[PDB]
């Protein structure tokens, strides 16, 4: 009846004021959440944003990472204080049909992330081991056994294995930046919140600064990682009776989370400056993982004689594919954990880790093998580009499930009927939190129409355009009705 019953309140190791050892003990949760923010679903957009705007968009990465740290810390607070996850709070404060809608929506979100991870991992196999594209996918389906071995390890090592992956993809991209020797003064200048990123005038590669910036801001948080953080934050036992101990517990998980999401922000920065310093100006014509592989393996695409010799040897691209693998491993852990959370929290369905990863991975690979089937039926022509368009079109479910995850979080944590007059949010985070939630909800409701129209490809059928307008209006209005309904129920609780 409590979230993550297998590992809930497992190891509590606060020892007086021995803080940093106490930090070492529970540092696990934050990395599990952050590694999701390094998935290859936006690797191209950081490199593309770098080529189109050298170092300019680095500040937007910082701001987005700050907002994500805010909402993530809020979810961790709900888990720590209330000893229950975000799904259990929402489901307890609304009916079952709303918990079911939220369930299917978040299932679709983690499914979209899973589609990104299976595409990137399968392509990683096609690049590293030269496995055929159709075989690499059905090889990625075998991660259920890696989950069986994953199940016996334990969170003191699982949450450290996630750290291992994090520093794998962090050192892979940092290594190609170390060889690049970039002008770190222009990087510093880029990290400062300037107003050139909010303008619309450069328009390089069909992208204005305001468009790229508003995209980075719009894709700030992942809805499933909120429920994830609120569930994993409970894995540390707390007496819930000593205010200094729970205040300490909140400091604990906060410093953890920021320590990890800061690493994710560093990875995004390494991707942008990877697009600025490593690649030549405009060398990336194919945002696909294969396009970045050949672009990282062509000496004329780099901007340094050392990167040309290393690229000719063939180490820059292989490291890239390794990073693709390490990123593709994340949805196997966090997808199963979060899927359990939203399942047994929203619809009260107790399912094992066996059938969970099976169903999610199958539903994820069905459109992948359909796409590979059609493109290989066209002669393996534009097969990687179509996989990239599938990966990008999948991310609409995140925009569908985002408001119903950030709005109830902010409400339930801002009410004293859930946190109490002692641990509710400061007036400082009330303003920043509501500002962030409003901005993200508006931006994603804007993204709905763009992605729904993007389903019909770059070929704008005049009759299908109006249909995309009707469907978009219907979807955003339906999300408005669901949103005001949820607002009404939660505010009835408070
Ligand atoms: C597209 C146009 C964009 C315009 C952007 C303008 C930004 C306005 C910021 C408003 O700030 C919040 O608005 C909530 C609504 O009025 C207030 O009530 C809130 O009060 C509690 C939080 O303190 C919550 O628990 C409640 O659910 C909620 O009603 C809340 O006090 C306040 O901080």
Author numbering: 13 to 506
The authors write:
at a resolution of 3.3 Å. intertwined and aligned in opposite orientation within the membrane. that, in this crystal form, EcoDMT exhibits substantial structural differences. similarity to ScaDMT allows for a reliable comparison of equivalent segments. ScaDMT adopting an inward-facing and EcoDMT an outward-facing state. EcoDMT has now revealed the opposite endpoint within the transport cycle. equivalence of EcoDMT to an outward-facing state. α-helix 4 that is not observed in LeuT. be suitable for the coordination of Ca2+.
conserved and function as secondary active transporters. transport proteins that include the amino acid transporter LeuT18. μM range and that metal ion transport is coupled to the cotransport of protons. of the prokaryotic SLC11 transporter EcoDMT.
